[PDB]
């Protein structure tokens, strides 16, 4: 009895010629622009920490996930914010969103960064860990999320004593991302 291989998607960091592939799943995925146009210009800037995409057999863009630095109360802590997060509306349900953030947060601790953020529904990131960060005393600039902003750490220890504002790079002052 022979088993035919079940058809996955890998899940890798991005390189250049990934690029436009991810902005096509952005723009596709996305109510708006916003998220393309963040990641377009995190990249340009050098402000993207590291991002992982999902690949169909053909090699095309089907998921993607990214993470740029942040500063608590204006110190480097080597914390990351997590966004954006998105699957191909043809792989959806498959669990990838899921591997896509598992892989990221274990190749952020990895490389020794010891916690993540993100604003987004709670429903949806305390399924991959994340947990209020106001219950933690930490919050982002923008009005509105303290019921939607998170956090998920690396290290055991690494959210005692770390209070405060916590900064996302100045290209997220954009109108229309997810969560806010
Ligand atoms: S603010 C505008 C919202 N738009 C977006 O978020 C972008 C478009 N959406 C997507 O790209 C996908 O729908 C995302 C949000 C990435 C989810 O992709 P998948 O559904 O394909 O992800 P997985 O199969 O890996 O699922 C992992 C777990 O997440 C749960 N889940 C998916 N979607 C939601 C929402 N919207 N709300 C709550 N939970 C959600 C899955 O059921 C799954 O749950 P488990 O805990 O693994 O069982």
């Given at each position: 009895?022979?088993?035919?291989?079940?058809?996955?998607?890998?899940?890798?960091?991005?390189?250049?010629?990934?690029?436009?592939?991810?902005?096509?799943?952005?723009?596709?995925?996305?109510?708006?622009?916003?998220?393309?146009?963040?990641?377009?210009?995190?990249?340009?800037?050098?402000?993207?920490?590291?991002?992982?995409?999902?690949?169909?057999?053909?090699?095309?863009?089907?998921?993607?996930?990214?993470?740029?630095?942040?500063?608590?109360?204006?110190?480097?802590?080597?914390?990351?914010?997590?966004?954006?997060?998105?699957?191909?509306?043809?792989?959806?349900?498959?669990?990838?969103?899921?591997?896509?953030?598992?892989?990221?947060?274990?190749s952020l601790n990895e490389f020794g960064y010891a916690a993540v953020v993100t604003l987004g529904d709670p429903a949806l990131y305390s399924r991959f860990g994340f947990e209020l960060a106001a219950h933690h005393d930490l919050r982002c600039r923008w009005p509105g999320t303290e019921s939607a902003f998170q956090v998920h750490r690396l290290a055991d220890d690494a959210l005692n004593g770390v209070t405060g504002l916590v900064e996302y790079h100045e290209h997220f002052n954009r109108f229309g991302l997810c969560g806010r």
């Open positions: 009895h022979h088993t035919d291989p079940a058809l996955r998607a890998l899940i890798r960091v991005e390189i250049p010629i990934d690029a436009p592939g991810i902005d096509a799943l952005l723009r596709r995925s996305f109510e708006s622009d916003a998220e393309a146009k963040l990641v377009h210009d995190l990249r340009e800037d050098g402000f993207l920490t590291l991002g992982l995409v999902a690949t169909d057999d053909e090699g095309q863009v089907i998921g993607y996930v990214a993470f740029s630095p942040v500063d608590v109360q204006g110190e480097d802590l080597q914390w990351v914010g997590m966004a954006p997060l998105a699957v191909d509306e043809k792989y959806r349900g498959q669990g990838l969103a899921r591997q896509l953030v598992y892989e990221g947060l274990d």
